[PDB]
Amino acid sequence: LSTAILKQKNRPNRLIVDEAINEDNSVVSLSQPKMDELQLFRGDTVLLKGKKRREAVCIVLSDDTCSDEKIRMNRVVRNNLRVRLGDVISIQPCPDVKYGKRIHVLPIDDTVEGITGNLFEVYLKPYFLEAYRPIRKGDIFLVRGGMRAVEFKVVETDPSPYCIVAPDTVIHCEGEPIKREDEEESLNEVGYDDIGGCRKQLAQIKEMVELPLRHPALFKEIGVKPPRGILLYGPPGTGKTLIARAVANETGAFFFLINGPEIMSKLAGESESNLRKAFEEAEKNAPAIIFIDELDAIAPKREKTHGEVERRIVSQLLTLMDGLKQRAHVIVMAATNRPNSIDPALRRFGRFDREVDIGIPDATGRLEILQIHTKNMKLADDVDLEQVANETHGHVGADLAALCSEAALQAIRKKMDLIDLEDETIDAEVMNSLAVTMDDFRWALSQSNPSALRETVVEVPQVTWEDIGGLEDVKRELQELVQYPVEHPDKFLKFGMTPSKGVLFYGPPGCGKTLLAKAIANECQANFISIKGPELLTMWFGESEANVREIFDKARQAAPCVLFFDELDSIAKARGGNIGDGGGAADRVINQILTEMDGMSTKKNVFIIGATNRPDIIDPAILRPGRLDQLIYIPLPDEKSRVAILKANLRKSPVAKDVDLEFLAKMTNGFSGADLTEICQRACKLAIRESIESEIVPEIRRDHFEEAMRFARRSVSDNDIRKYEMFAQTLQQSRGF
Amino acid sequence: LSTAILKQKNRPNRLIVDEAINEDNSVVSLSQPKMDELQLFRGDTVLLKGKKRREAVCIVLSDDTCSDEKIRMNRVVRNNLRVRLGDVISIQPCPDVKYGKRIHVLPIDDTVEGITGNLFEVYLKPYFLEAYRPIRKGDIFLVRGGMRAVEFKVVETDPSPYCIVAPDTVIHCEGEPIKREDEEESLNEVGYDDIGGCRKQLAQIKEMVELPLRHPALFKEIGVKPPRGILLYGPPGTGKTLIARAVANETGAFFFLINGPEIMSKLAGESESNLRKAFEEAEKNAPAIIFIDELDAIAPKREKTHGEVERRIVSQLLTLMDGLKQRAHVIVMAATNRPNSIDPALRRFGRFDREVDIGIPDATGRLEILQIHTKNMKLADDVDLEQVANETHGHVGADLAALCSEAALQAIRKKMDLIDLEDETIDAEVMNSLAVTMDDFRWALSQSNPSALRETVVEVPQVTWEDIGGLEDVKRELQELVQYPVEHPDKFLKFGMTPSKGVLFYGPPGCGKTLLAKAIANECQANFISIKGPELLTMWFGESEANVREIFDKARQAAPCVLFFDELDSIAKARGGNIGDGGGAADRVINQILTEMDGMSTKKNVFIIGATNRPDIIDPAILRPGRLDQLIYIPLPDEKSRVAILKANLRKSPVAKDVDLEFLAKMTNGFSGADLTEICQRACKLAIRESIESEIVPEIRRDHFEEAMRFARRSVSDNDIRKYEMFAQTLQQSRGF
Ligand SMILES: Nc1ncnc2c1ncn2[C@@H]1O[C@H](COP(=O)(O)OP(=O)(O)OP(O)(O)=S)[C@@H](O)[C@H]1O
Ligand SMILES: Nc1ncnc2c1ncn2[C@@H]1O[C@H](COP(=O)(O)OP(=O)(O)OP(O)(O)=S)[C@@H](O)[C@H]1O
Ligand SMILES: Nc1ncnc2c1ncn2[C@@H]1O[C@H](COP(=O)(O)OP(=O)(O)OP(O)(O)=S)[C@@H](O)[C@H]1O
Ligand SMILES: Nc1ncnc2c1ncn2[C@@H]1O[C@H](COP(=O)(O)OP(=O)(O)OP(O)(O)=S)[C@@H](O)[C@H]1O
Ligand SMILES: [Mg+2]
Ligand SMILES: [Mg+2]
């Protein structure tokens, strides 16, 4: 529903074109039935719209040879104009055009490379028939009679509308030929097709940029106003500049790029004039887009600033931006990488009220980035872009660009022996043999290049319910207070409660308190944030009180979200617990968590799950009825529960049928899940030890498990079982005394 | 009494006009009896006063057709001039007017759109009779003979008083027609009708602005002086700029707007001249109002300032403002969002002595804001603005503006399939089908848009006495020391005491110590401030000693107020209690609270209520006779008291008559109110679990309660009951040893 605009379906008229047996690759595709709805008369040309204001004209009504009701595929229409299939193309007439009078010929590498002669009748006579060069400023045509070597372009634009070359004219031989850099630079512009892994973010940009300007009367009738402030923020390298460069070409509005350091490097008083002129320009025309790059580099905080000239820029910006009215139709956009170093006065009502966050993509996001980035390189058949995306975790779109370059350099390293450093030019018989293989990427994933920045990742865990053995009742209970209050909200206002948000896990260590938290988030298809114990202690190093609030602020925006706190024992261990040094374990970070938890609304979908293994040093203040009410105890697995753990831990291992899984169930009594995992990890090393010494077979036998039982140590003493059971029944009574 | 001016009643002469059956909608309303009190002779026009210096003239003495003693409702008087009914309109004669001589015709979209011809006798002949265009600069009339399409306005103003067009003149055809932006911009000005949820605040502004200037002789006879400094402060987004923009149009005095960043962005020495000229202008005329926006952005603290030019502005302002005398009649107004970042020298006697605080509105306040904001949008019949106001808690007038825009965007999202992005213009047969439905707001209340700033809210709690079960004596006792010393102050000076302010609650947890504090505040119709335990610990992060004093300062101004401290155990838990690490639990925040409490006057209405559940680690210093004297102990509910708790917790649930409420009273012995609430919350989930699985009935049966008794755990041990009773009798003896 939210992304229904981007969908392109529900049209039986159109279909996918298969491979045809026709060899007619020198004619356009024209069909008769489509000719009955247009009102085109017997004119000269047909006007159509493509993309990026780039079209192409050819001979009309000349095919009548190929199949019908099918667009003929050509080897020249796949590079320009059209790039794919599934785009709606509309045509409209445009009379009162102005024909051209005099257009000269400007060659590049066709006349100077060969023979010049008269440049009129040398090779143009066999083409000047039935068409007086129907050319246009922005079209690249093709004509030759020799060795297939010709490339002609035009740069002079005398008329504003479309023009047609008239016969009986002269040739202006006093012009400068165009070089290669100019045509190459304005041919490889980026667009919406070069952005991968970001679909929801780009949907919101269109609804605020390509709708108020194109259809200004839509919002006037309703009575609402479009936003005039859009702010982009995220980690450095996500691709913020790509969005700015892509929205500047797909839209037919004026774009004015504003640099951050360029304004900051001007003289005294010169910086203030360029800002005024930028807006005085944009207010002249109705369609205008203003983009500012690195806003924080030009308008920092006014309290940590020692220079008056630096504050003058902030004052000038605050003066110029709030002076905009409705009829100006000016949209101001900005992008930065430090949302916290901003000045508070900018992100207020009227200046920057709408914000777009660019998060770190998951494997699906980076797969598309790799596919679109490696579209022109020569790849082999053993490559696999899906496998690479699984091993990369902290890689943003900037890292994938360098990874491919490193892989290409490693691939071409091995061809060092037949070329030389002092050699003049490389021979062409080895130029075509370079191809990136699978082993190239494996070496690139083991150096300092993958060493990048990695932060708190908000995504959906891949842990399923099949990886957890036993605990039938816990899984049922977890689904009755997370899945129900989200999928069917109508079941709660009828009886008249509010759902209870908050569950605390307690029990002996090594029972699987993290897999339960991940599986419930995976089942409901919600976000998951994992904050560990020591991370909160080390985060607070320079006494900053703004490093925990934005965690809740980020979790609130990504609704539904599951906020989980892991290893809650280390925090209580900082002071000691109930008595500690003499006070309590209610330290600086406990109060912030309690205050942020108490302020959450009852209509939100942010669910909080707690887990700990020290039910004797917990803070009584957190057990209040309204922060963490639910108490779930996970006991040690019994004989029946341990059957599934071994089968779940051996899914990817070729276990032989002779191994009796039920025999090891009764052998182990005081062993938890971690002990069984250790037993599996130890017993399967014997097969590797034997297989590596046999080389001077690849399957785990029965004798491998019998050897590890004499070395399997117990991790849970008999005294701890007697102590956990006491707190398993009387835990809510700890408050007060 | 305080708001008696705003009341409009006590007048039997006027009444409400109902619907009439007359179809005469082309004539003015004139009545005979009202013609006997005025002294208007047989002149030409009648002068009357409306609002915003905008009037309207028409044909006088021509109706004599409609009913009598009733103002006829018209379809053209509801847009301009008059907007409602109940305003006193007075008339006065004004002789010695100057008639006009030459007024040309300036069309907008009536002459250029069609046929021009001579522009004199084309369509104006059938109107030039019995009236020589009685027009005025500020009136919009209506005349047509075609398709009802005409809009004529005038911009040239040669005479100062009212003028009448004289016959036998010429037409000045050398003028520039007026565009659409100019007429639209000065038509939608904001006023007092666009401010909702603020009635008491606007009452004080009038008594200081629209009274000393209009009636300067009132204060001279008494011998007092009107204030010359008004400061506005509050959270960002409350609508401070609206008040400034509204008071500038409803008053007939000169207004000069002063920006904050615009002055700060000037050159060296240029900023000081604009400030001098602003006052040198205002001193010329008697009625003058000076408003400064964002005072803190121009005059910060002089100790945290590194620039000399920035301090020069503060020195210049301090020099210019105190130089004003009585006869200048100049009122200086300012508005800021950070009252603490101010310079101390400005908020003194003579510069800024009077301050207006704009608090966060309650549900009633935001309902009016929503009603006035959604006055032009197309709403459906299933909408309900009252329900939306209940779910929004931390929403200021700025947030409601964006909420409606988001709802409108969501409503128009679903119409994506019949319009296209590349389409030229939208057809008119779907332009009228857009309407906001109920489901639009539900989606808007679940995204990042409602995520706004929320602070300490001062309002009246909605908790009544019917939601509390038992405790007959506690409710009676609470009414004898809060309700009595406020409603009937005369009962205390006769016998000769001072009332005792301060009550401390102590007892086992989960008995309802917060509902008692809220109900007494609700009954007496007073404010309520809830400050929790951890909030005081986390507030003090950067060692600021000005974060607790303004809490008492704010509570003092909103008299009567009830200041309540919740969870007073965590503060004592910071050090340990009586012994702790070796010292005491009298930490940094205890002394501030004690010092602020000792300094309160005995004539104030600020009542302080304390509540805790740790009567063994309390500070003996706080039990002094004069801070917290009253000691109230809340015991566990008995069999009789628990009868009402279940009935109070099941008011919104359809409980069947077969469920015996008296059967569960004797079954529970050591269960407090929280345990019963948990039992209710657990037993009613079984009905939902059954109703969700039956779909592959909506009423709680008897078997749902019998299942939860086997899982109901006790939260109060037998040892804690024996310990609370000891302190319930000997608590005041803890002081000294
Ligand atoms: N989604 C993407 N698809 C393909 N290439 C991408 C993508 N995102 C980033 N890149 C590439 O990575 C580069 C990173 O540049 P940007 O992230 O745009 O720089 P930035 O956002 O301004 O942040 P800086 O430069 O580190 S301060 C881009 O220029 C592209 O070459
Ligand atoms: N039922 C189970 N089936 C398979 N593996 C399990 C099961 N329960 C636990 N494990 C594994 O045992 C290990 C326990 O890791 P954790 O989740 O960290 O344990 P924990 O309960 O969170 O307590 P700690 O303090 O972290 S050891 C992981 O490797 C799990 O994959
Ligand atoms: N009572 C109200 N009724 C209707 N609309 C309101 C009301 N209060 C605020 N608004 C709207 O919300 C906007 C908020 O602007 P203001 O609060 O006036 O800005 P400000 O008070 O100067 O504080 P800033 O701009 O955040 S520093 C107004 O411009 C209105 O559009
Ligand atoms: N007499 C009662 N009738 C109905 N509900 C009650 C009654 N007494 C308490 N409750 C409920 O029980 C819960 C107790 O919450 P609190 O007011 O926080 O308890 P408290 O006495 O303040 O002590 P703590 O430390 O906060 S648990 C709330 O959900 C109340 O609505
Ligand atoms: Mg773990
Ligand atoms: Mg309470």
Author numbering:
A (entry chain A), B (entry chain B): 12 to 707, 728 to 768
Text of the article:
The human AAA+ ATPase p97, also known as valosin-containing protein, a potential target for cancer therapeutics, plays a vital role in the clearing of misfolded proteins. p97 dysfunction is also known to play a crucial role in several neurodegenerative disorders, such as MultiSystem Proteinopathy 1 (MSP-1) and Familial Amyotrophic Lateral Sclerosis (ALS). pmcp97 is a member of the classic clade of AAA+ ATPases and is an essential cellular enzyme. p97 is composed of six protomers forming a homo-hexamer with an N-terminal domain (NTD) and two tandem ATPase domains D1 and D2 (1). p97 is an essential protein in regulating cellular homeostasis from membrane fusion, Endoplasmic Reticulum-Associated Degradation, Mitochondrial-Associated Degradation (MAD), Chromatin-Associated Degradation to NF-κB activation (2). Critical functions for p97 include the translocation and restructuring of proteins from large cellular structures such as organelle membranes and extraction of ubiquitinated client proteins to facilitate their degradation through the ubiquitin-proteasome system. Here, we present cryo-EM structural analyses of four disease mutants p97R155H, p97R191Q, p97A232E, p97D592N, as well as p97E470D, implicated in resistance to the drug CB-5083, a potent p97 inhibitor.
Despite varying degrees of differences in the ADP-bound state as compared with p97WT, all three mutants display essentially similar structures when the D1 and D2 domains are bound to ATPγS and in the state corresponding to conformation III of p97WT. This is not surprising since R155, R191, and A232 are all exposed to solvent in conformation III, i.e., no longer interacting at the N-D1 interface; therefore the mutations at these sites are not expected to affect the quaternary conformation significantly.
